[PDB]
Structure 1
């Protein structure tokens, strides 16, 4: 296939490239610490008018 013919000659030929494909995926992004203060407008003690 790499050399278009049906009868190849004697010698060494570079056909293609070997390459292992990844198996899984990893997505890491920093620890979530600074959450928005949404508990102050949903669980407030005195709402507005």
Structure 2
């Protein structure tokens, strides 16, 4: 399972069940958005 734990993710990245001693970059972390925002101008009159 590639998303169980870092070792399994490494095994999937290398596509192997044995991992040699070393350091491997398996993925990329990035913060996810907390909420969405909409900022439109305060306009009310409907277009004719």
Verify same fold: TM over 0.5.
yes
Note the aligned Cα RMSD (angstroms): 1.4
**Structure (1 or 2) with the larger CA radius of gyration:** 1
Q: Which runs of 5+ in 1 are unaligned?
A: 37-49
User: In structure 2, what is the equivalent of residue 45 of structure 1?
Assistant: none
Question: Which structure exhibits the higher relative contact order, with contacts defined as CA atoms closer than 8 Å and separated by 6 or more residues?
Answer: 1
Structure 1 residue 16 and structure 2 residue 27: aligned? yes
Equivalent pairs counted in the alignment come to: 35
Which has a greater percent of helix? 2
- TM-score normalised to the size of structure 1? 0.60
Which has a greater percent of strand? 1
Q: Which runs of 5+ in 2 are unaligned?
A: 1-11
